[PDB]
Tab-separated table of C-alpha atoms and ligand atoms in Angstrom:
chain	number	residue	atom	x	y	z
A	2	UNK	CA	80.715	79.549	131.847
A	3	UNK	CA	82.238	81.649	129.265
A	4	UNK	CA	79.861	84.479	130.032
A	5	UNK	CA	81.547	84.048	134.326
A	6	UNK	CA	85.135	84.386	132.462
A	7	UNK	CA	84.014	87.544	130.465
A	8	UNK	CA	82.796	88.585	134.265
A	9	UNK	CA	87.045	89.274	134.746
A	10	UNK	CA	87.048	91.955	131.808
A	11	UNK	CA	87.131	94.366	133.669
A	12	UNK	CA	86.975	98.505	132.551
A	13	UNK	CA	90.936	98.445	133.330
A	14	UNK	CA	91.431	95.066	131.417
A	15	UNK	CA	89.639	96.079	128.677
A	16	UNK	CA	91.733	99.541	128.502
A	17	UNK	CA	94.560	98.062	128.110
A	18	UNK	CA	93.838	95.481	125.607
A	19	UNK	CA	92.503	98.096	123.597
A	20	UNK	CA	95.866	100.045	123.912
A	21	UNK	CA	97.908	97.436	123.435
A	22	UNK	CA	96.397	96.063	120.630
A	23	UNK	CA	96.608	99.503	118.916
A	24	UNK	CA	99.653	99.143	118.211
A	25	UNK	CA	100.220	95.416	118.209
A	26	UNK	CA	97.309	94.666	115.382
A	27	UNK	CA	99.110	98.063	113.284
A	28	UNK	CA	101.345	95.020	111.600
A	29	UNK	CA	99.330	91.750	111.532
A	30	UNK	CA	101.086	89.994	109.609
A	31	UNK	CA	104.335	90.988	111.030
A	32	UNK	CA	103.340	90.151	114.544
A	33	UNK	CA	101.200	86.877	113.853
A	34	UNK	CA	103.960	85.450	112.289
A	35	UNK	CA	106.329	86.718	115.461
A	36	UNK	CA	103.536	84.906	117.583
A	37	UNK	CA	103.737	81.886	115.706
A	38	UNK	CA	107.465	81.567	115.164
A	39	UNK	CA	107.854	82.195	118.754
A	40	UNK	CA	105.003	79.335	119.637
A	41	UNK	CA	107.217	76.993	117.852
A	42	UNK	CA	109.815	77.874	119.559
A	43	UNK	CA	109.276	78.129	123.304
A	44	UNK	CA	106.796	74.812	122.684
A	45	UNK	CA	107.862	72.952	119.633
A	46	UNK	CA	105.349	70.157	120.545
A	47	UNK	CA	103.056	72.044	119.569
A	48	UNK	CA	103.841	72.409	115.769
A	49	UNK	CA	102.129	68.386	115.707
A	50	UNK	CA	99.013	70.320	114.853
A	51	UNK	CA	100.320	72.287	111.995
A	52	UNK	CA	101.392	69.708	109.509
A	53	UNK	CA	99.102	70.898	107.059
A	54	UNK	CA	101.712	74.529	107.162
A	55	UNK	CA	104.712	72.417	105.759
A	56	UNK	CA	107.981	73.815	106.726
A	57	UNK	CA	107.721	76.159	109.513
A	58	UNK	CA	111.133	76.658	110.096
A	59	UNK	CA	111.013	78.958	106.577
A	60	UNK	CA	108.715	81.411	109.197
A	61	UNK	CA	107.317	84.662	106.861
A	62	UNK	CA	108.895	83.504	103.537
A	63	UNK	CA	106.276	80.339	104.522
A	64	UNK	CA	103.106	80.781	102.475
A	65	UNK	CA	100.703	78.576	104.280
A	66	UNK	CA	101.989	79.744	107.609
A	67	UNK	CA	102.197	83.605	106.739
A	68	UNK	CA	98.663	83.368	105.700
A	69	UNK	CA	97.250	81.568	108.893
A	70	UNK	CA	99.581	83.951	110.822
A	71	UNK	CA	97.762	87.000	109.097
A	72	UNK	CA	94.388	85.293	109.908
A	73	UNK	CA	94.785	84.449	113.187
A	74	UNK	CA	95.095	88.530	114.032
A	75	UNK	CA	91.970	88.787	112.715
A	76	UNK	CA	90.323	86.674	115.367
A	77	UNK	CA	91.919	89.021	117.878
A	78	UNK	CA	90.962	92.257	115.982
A	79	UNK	CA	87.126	90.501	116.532
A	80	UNK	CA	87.453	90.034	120.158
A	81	UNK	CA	88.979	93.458	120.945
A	82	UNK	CA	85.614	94.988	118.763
A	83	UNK	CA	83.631	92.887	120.961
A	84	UNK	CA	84.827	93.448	124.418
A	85	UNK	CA	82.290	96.324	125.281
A	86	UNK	CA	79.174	93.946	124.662
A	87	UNK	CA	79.456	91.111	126.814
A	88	UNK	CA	77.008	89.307	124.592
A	89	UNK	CA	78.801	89.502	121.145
A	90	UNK	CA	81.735	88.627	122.311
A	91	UNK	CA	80.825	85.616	123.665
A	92	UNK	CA	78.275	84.408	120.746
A	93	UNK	CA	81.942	85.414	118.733
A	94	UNK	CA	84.259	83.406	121.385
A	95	UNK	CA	82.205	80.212	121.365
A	96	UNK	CA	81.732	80.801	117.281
A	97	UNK	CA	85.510	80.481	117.312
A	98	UNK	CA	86.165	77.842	119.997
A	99	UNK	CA	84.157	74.725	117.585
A	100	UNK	CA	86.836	74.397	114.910
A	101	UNK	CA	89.438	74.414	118.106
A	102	UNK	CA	87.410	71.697	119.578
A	103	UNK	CA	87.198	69.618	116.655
A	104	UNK	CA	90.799	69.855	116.383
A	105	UNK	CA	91.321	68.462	119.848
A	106	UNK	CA	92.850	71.279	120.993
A	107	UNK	CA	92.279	71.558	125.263
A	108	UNK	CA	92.650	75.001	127.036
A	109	UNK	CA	95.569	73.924	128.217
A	110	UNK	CA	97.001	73.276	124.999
A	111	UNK	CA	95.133	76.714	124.239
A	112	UNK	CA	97.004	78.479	126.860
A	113	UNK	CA	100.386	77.862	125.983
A	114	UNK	CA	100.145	81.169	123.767
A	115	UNK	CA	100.341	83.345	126.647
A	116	UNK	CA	103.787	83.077	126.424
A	117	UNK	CA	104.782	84.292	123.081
A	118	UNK	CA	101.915	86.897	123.813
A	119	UNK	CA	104.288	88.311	126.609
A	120	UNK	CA	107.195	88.047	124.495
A	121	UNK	CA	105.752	90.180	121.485
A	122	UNK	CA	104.364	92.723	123.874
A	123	UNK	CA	107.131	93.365	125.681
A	124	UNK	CA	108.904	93.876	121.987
A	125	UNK	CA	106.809	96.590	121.550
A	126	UNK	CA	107.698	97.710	125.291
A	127	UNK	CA	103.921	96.321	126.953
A	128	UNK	CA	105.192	95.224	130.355
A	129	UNK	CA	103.813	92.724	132.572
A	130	UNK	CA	100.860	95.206	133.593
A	131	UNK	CA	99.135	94.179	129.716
A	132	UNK	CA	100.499	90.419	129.487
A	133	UNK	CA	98.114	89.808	132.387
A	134	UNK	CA	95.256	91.613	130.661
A	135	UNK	CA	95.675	89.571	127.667
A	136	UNK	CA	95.928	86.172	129.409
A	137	UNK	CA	92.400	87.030	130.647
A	138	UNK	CA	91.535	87.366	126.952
A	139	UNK	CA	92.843	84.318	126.488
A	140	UNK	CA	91.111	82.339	129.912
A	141	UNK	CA	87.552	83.803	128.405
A	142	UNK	CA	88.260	81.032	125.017
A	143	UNK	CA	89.604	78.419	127.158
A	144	UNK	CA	86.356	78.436	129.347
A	145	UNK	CA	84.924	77.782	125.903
A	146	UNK	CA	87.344	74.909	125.180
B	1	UNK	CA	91.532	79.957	87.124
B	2	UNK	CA	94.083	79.744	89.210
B	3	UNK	CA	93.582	81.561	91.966
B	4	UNK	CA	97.019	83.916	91.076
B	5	UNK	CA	95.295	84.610	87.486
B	6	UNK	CA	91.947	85.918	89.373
B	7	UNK	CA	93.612	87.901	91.952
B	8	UNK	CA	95.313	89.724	88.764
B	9	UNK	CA	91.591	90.362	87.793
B	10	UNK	CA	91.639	93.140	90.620
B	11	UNK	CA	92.195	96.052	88.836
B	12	UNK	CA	93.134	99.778	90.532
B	13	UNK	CA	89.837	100.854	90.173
B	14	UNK	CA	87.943	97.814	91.169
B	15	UNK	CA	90.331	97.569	94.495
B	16	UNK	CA	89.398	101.600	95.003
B	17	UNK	CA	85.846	100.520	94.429
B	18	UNK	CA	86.256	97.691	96.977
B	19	UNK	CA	87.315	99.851	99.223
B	20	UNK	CA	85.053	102.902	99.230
B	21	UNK	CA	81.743	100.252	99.401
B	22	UNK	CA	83.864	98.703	102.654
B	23	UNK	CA	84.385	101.855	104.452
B	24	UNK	CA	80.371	101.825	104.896
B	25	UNK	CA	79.291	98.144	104.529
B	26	UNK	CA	82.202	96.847	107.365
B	27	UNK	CA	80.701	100.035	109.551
B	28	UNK	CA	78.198	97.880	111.092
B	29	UNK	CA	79.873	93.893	110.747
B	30	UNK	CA	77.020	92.576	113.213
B	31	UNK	CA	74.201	94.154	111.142
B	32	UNK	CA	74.777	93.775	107.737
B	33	UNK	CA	76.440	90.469	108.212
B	34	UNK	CA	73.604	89.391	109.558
B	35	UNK	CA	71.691	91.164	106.521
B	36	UNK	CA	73.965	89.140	104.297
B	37	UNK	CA	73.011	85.617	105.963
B	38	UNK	CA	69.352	86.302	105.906
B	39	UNK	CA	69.512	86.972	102.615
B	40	UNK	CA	71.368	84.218	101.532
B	41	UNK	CA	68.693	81.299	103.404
B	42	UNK	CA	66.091	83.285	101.739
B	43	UNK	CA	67.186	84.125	98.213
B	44	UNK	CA	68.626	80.454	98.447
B	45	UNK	CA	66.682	77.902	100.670
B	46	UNK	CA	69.186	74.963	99.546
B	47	UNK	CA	71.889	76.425	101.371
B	48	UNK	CA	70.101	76.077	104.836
B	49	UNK	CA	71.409	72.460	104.863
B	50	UNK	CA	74.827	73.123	105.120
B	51	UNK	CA	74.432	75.403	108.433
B	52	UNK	CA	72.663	72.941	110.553
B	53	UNK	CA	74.665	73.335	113.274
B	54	UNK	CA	73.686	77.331	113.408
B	55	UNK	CA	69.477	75.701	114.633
B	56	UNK	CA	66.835	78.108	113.710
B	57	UNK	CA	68.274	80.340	111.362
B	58	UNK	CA	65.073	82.437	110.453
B	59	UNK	CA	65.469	84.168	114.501
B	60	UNK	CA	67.862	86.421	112.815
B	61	UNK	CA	69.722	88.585	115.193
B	62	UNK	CA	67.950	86.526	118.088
B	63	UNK	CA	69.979	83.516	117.384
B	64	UNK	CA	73.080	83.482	119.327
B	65	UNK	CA	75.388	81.781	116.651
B	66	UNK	CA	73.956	83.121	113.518
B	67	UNK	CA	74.477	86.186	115.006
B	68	UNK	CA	78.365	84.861	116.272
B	69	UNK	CA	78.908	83.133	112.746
B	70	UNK	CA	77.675	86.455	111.026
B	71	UNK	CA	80.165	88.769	112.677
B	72	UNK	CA	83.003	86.600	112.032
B	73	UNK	CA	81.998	86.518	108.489
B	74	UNK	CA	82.512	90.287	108.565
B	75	UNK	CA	86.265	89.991	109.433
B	76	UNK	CA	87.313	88.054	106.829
B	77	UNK	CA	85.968	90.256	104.432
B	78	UNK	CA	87.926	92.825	106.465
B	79	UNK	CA	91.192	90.146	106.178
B	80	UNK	CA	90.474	90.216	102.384
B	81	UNK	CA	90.340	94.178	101.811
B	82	UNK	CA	93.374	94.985	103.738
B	83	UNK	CA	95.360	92.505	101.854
B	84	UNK	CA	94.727	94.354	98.384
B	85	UNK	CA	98.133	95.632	98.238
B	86	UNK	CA	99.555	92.663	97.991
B	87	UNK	CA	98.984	90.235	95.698
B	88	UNK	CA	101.380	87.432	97.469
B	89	UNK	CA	99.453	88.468	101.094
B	90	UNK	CA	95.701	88.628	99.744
B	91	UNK	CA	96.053	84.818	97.875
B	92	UNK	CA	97.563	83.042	100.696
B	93	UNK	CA	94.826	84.530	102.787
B	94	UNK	CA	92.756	83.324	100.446
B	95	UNK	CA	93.725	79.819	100.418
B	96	UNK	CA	93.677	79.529	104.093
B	97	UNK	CA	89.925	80.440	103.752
B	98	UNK	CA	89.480	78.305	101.447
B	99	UNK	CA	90.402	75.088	103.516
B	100	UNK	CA	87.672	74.943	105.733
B	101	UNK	CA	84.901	75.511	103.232
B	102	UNK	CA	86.784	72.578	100.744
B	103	UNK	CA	86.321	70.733	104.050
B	104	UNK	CA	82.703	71.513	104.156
B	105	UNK	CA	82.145	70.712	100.560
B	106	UNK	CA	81.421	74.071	99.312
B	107	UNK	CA	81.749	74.185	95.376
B	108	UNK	CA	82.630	77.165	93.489
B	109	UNK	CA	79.133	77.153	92.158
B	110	UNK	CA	77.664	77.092	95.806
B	111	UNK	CA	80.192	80.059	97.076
B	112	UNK	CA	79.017	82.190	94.217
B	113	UNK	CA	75.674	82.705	95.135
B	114	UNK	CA	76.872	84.641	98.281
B	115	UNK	CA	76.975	87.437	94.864
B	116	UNK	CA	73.337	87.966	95.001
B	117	UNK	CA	72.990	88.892	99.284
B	118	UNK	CA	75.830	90.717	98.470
B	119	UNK	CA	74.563	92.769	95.601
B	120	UNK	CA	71.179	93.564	97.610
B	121	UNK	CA	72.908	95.227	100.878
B	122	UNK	CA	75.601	97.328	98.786
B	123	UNK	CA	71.581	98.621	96.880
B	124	UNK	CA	70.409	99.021	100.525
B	125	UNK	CA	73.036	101.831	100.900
B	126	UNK	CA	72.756	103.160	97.642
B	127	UNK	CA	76.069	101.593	96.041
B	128	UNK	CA	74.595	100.435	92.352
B	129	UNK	CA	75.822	97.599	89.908
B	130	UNK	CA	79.366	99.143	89.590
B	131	UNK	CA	80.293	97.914	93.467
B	132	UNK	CA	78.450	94.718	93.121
B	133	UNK	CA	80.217	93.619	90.295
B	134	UNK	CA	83.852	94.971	91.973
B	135	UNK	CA	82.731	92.484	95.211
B	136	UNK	CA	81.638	89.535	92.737
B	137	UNK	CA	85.310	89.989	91.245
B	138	UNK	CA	86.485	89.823	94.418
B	139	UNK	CA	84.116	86.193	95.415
B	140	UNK	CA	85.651	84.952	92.364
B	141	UNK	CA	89.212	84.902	93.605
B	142	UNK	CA	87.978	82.827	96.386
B	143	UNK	CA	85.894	80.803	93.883
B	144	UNK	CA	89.218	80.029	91.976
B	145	UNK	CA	90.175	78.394	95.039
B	146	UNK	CA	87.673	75.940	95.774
C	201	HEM	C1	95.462	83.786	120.458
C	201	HEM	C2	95.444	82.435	119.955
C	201	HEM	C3	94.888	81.907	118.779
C	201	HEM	C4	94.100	82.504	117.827
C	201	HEM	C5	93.566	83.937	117.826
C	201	HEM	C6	93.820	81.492	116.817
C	201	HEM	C7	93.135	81.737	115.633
C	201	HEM	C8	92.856	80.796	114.647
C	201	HEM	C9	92.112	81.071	113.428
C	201	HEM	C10	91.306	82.319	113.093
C	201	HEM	C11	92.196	79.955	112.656
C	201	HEM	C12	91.600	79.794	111.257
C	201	HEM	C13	90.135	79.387	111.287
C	201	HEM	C14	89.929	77.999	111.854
C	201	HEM	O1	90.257	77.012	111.157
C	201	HEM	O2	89.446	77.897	113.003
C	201	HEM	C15	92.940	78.979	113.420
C	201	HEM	C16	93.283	77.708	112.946
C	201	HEM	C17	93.997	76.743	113.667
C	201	HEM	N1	94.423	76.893	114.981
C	201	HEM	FE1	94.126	78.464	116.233
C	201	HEM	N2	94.366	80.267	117.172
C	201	HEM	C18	95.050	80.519	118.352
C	201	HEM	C19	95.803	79.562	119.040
C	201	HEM	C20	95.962	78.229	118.668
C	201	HEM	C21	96.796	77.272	119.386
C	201	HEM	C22	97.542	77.561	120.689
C	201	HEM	C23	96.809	76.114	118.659
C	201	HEM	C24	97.416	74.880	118.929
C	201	HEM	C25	98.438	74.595	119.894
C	201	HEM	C26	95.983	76.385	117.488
C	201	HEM	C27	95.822	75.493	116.425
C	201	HEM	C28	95.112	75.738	115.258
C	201	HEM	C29	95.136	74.857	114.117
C	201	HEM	C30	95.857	73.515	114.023
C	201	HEM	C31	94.471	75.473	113.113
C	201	HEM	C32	94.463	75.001	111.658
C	201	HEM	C33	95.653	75.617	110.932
C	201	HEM	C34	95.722	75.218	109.471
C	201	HEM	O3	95.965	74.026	109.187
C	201	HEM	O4	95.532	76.100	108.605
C	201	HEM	N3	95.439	77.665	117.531
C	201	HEM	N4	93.287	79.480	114.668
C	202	HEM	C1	81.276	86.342	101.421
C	202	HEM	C2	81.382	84.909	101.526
C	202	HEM	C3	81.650	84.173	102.680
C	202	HEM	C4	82.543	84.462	103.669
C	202	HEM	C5	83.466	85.683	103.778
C	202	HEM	C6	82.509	83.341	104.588
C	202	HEM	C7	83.200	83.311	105.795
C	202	HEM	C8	83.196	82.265	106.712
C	202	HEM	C9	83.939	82.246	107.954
C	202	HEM	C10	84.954	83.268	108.452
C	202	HEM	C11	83.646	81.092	108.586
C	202	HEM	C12	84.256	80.673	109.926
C	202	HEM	C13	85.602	79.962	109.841
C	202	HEM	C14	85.489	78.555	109.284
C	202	HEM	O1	84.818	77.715	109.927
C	202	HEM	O2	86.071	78.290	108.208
C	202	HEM	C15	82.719	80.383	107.725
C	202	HEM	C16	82.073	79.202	108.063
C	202	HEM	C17	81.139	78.555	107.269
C	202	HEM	N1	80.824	78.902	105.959
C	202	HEM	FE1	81.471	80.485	104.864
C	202	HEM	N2	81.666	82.344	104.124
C	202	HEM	C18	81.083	82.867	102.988
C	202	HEM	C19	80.135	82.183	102.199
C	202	HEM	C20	79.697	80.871	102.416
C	202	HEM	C21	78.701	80.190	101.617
C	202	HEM	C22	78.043	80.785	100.370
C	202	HEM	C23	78.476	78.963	102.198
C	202	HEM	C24	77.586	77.941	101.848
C	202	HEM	C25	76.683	77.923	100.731
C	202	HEM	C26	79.374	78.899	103.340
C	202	HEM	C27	79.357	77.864	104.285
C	202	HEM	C28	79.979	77.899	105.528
C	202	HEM	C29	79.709	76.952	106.584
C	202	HEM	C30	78.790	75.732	106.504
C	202	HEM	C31	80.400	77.366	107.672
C	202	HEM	C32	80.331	76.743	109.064
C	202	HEM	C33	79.263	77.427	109.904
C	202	HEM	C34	79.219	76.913	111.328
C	202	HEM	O3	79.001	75.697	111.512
C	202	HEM	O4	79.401	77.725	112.260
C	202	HEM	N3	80.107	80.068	103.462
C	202	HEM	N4	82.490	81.088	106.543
């Protein structure tokens, strides 16, 4: 299942993931939190799950969410290492999807990142061309979800 | 031990030491983090009990999520050096970590004997005592946590 999503990685997909993320993981904690803050915003249902972070609305100056901001990049960073041996990546993916799925969270819950995805791409100028790239990143953890 | 009193604990030259031993022990995540887990169930047998969910741990690389848990491993270490410049940055990255093995019930006294598997693949590639006891400064900011 997750193996058939990894199937739509293709060479160009993976090209521009790699690009992208060049420049997009160069400030981690910059753009985890802009990921985050943006989450919130666009889908502020979705903060339920992140009681534990305290006041959100503080954004970097936020401790507890600055940290699992910076953290969160590092999943990524791990996925974009992986994506030229289909079977790390998903051992890695399906490593990462338990503590998702004991948290309840579904893939369609999961997939309301690719929105603030788009957004801080196209911040950094990554058109429409790499949002779609990315949302197959993301499809290959919601097939584990 | 508070974990802001231990993160003072990392000196300039234990931080440069941290970071040479990196640029060759993070070169290969999947191998030596595998190195580092086999190590671990065999220097330490008790610990086995706590990664259940990982089945037959002694297929090394062969098993699918040792080998997935293993990696990941690897990156936090990665999270960990490249927060050394700050202070504020490295300890609430620390405390995140910390969360889900205070979930899992992992003591201070448990975490630290990730020091030994640690010490024995920094030897493997010729980095002495010195490194070893720069990385178990670093395990004992995390240890400060838990
Ligand atoms: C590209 C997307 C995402 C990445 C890379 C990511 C990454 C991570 C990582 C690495 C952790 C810390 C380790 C762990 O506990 O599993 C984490 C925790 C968590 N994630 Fe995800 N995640 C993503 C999206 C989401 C979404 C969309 C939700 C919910 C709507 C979510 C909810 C959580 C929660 C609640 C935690 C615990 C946070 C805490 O209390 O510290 N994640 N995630
Ligand atoms: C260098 C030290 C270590 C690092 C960097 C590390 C890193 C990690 C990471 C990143 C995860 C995945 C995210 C999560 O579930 O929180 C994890 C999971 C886990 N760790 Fe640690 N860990 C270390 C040492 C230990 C030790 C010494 C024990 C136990 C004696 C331990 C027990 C666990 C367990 C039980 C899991 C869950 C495994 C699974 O079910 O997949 N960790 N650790």
């Amino acid at each position: 299942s997750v193996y058939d999503a990894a199937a739509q990685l293709t060479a160009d997909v993976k090209k521009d993931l790699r690009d992208s993320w060049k420049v997009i993981g160069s400030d981690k904690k910059g753009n985890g939190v802009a990921l985050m803050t943006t989450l919130f915003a666009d889908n502020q249902e979705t903060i339920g799950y992140f009681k534990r972070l305290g006041d959100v609305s503080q954004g970097m100056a936020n401790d507890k969410l600055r940290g699992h901001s910076i953290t969160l990049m590092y999943a990524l960073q791990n996925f974009i290492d992986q994506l030229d041996n289909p079977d790390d990546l998903v051992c890695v993916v399906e490593k990462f999807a338990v503590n998702h799925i004991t948290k309840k969270i579904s893939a369609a819950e999961f997939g309301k990142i690719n929105g603030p995805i788009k957004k801080v791409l196209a911040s950094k100028n990554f058109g429409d061309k790499y949002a779609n790239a990315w949302a197959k990143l993301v499809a290959v953890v919601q097939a584990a979800l």
